[PDB]
Structure formats: C-alpha cells, structure tokens
Amino acid sequence: MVSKGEELFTGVVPILVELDGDVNGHKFSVSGEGEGDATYGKLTLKFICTTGKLPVPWPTLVTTFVTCFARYPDHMRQHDFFKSAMPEGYVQERTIFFKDDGNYKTRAEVKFEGDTLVNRIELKGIDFKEDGNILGHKLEYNYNSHNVYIMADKQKNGIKANFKIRHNIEDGSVQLADHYQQNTPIGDGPVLLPDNHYLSYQSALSKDPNEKRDHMVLLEFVTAAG
C-alpha cells in the first residue's frame, strides 16, 4: 500500500524556501524557488538574497537550503521518515560548527502549503571572526559530494545525523563545518522511524548570467542507500 506522505511526492513538486538570518548581527533574508522530483532525488533551486549582499558565503548555506525529496528506493520505503511526516511536516534543527570560527544554529519547518513544499528557516550565527573565512568571504564557490548517516531518534519520534562538510578556502586549505542534526514531526500522527542508512548527496553550484542580485543556483541529488 502507498501512504499519504509518499503519494504527495509522486510527481514534480514546486518548492519555496524562505530564510531569515542574523550572523554576528549581520541580518539578511533569502528566498528560493524551484522544483523537487523525489523519484529521481532531484532538486533544482534558485536563491536570491533579498536584502542586498549575502554576508556569508553561499556554499555555507547549501545544507540549510527538504530531505523529503530524497530518492528512497522501493526496498527502503518503510524507512522514509521525511515523507511519512507530510503534509503536516517536520522541524529540522542543526548546529553547524565552523572549525576555528563561529557557529550557525538553524531551525527549519518543512511542510506543505497547498501543493507547494515550503522550507521556512531561521538561522542564527554567533562567534564568527569578522575577518575569517566566513565573514571575510574566503570560500570557493564549489561543493563536494557526501554520504550522511541517518539514525532513528526513537525517544524524539524522529531522526538524527552528524556529518562533516569541507568547504574549500581560496588558498587551497579547508574550512570544516561540523553538522549536528535532529528532525522531529510537527504533527501528532505516526511516522516511519528508520533503520540506520545513509543519504548520498551531490551538489552543483552555478550562476544565472541574467541575474544582477546576489544569488545561487543549486542542482542537488539525494539518494538513500542501505
């Protein structure tokens, strides 16, 4: 049998992303739009900084900017927490520790508003170096592929993960961003709590040649594996 959650993702779904951020008192907002195709694990999104210049590097926001679009193959269908929480949705919380620099704390509500999948995010960053790799914009506009290990958090009726992103610094070095994550349902209904597994990510960053606002184009694929 196919569940309500699963059924919401059988075709291409429009996505809206909204982020309000404050990093060391530098306030900013980002909107994003695009589409998700969970059958392929495919996200196509374009983000605009609506407040002017983004005060942090675009790559540092990629993980923050809808795991319900992951491709869970049929044999893993009983392990897809993210879709099982829909349409009421889930809250994704992270702390992202930038090594030798500050940290982001993020809280995102991921839920349907009609036929649109919304990712609504608040991001708070503190303890950054005003001349470091983040506030000083010293990170390259590129991205690595990663596997992220997902575990059930049965007590919390959700999932957790921790993983490392390694941003490339312009001098050839690496800026580590250590991610700690917890997701919990918004509603009171049943969800699927998964066996341990991983999600395989690839992300490609580009620019729209006709866009004069500060922006990022993201093509990302997310696939579950045992």
Which of 33, 99, 109 minimizes the C-alpha distance to 60?
99
166: left (phi over 0), alpha (psi -120 to 50) or beta: beta
| Cα–Cα distance measured from residue 116 to residue 164, given in angstroms and rounded to the nearest whole number | 30
Which of 68, 108, 94 minimizes the C-alpha distance to 192?
68
SS3 (DSSP) at 74: helix
The answer to whether the CB of 22 falls within 8 A of the CB of 124 is yes
> How many residues does this entry show for the chain?
226
Q: Which domains does the chain have, with CATH numbers?
A: 1-226 (2.40.155.10)
Look-up of token digits 């001098």: 171
Q: Please tell me the experimental approach by which this structure was elucidated.
A: X-ray
The answer to whether the CB of 148 falls within 8 A of the CB of 170 is no
Find out whether the peptide bond into 209 is cis, omega within 30 degrees of 0. no
Pairing of strands 146-153, 158-168: antiparallel
Cα atoms found within 13 Å of the Cα of residue 48, Cβ hemisphere only: 11
**Count of CB atoms situated within 10 Å of the CB of 128:** 22
Which of 47, 73, 33 minimizes the C-alpha distance to 197?
73
- In the chain, breaks (C-N over 2.5 A) are found after 65
Pairing of strands 12-23, 116-126: parallel
**Count of CB atoms situated within 10 Å of the CB of 104:** 24
Q: How far apart are the first and last CA of the chain?
A: 22
The answer to whether the CB of 86 falls within 8 A of the CB of 5 is yes
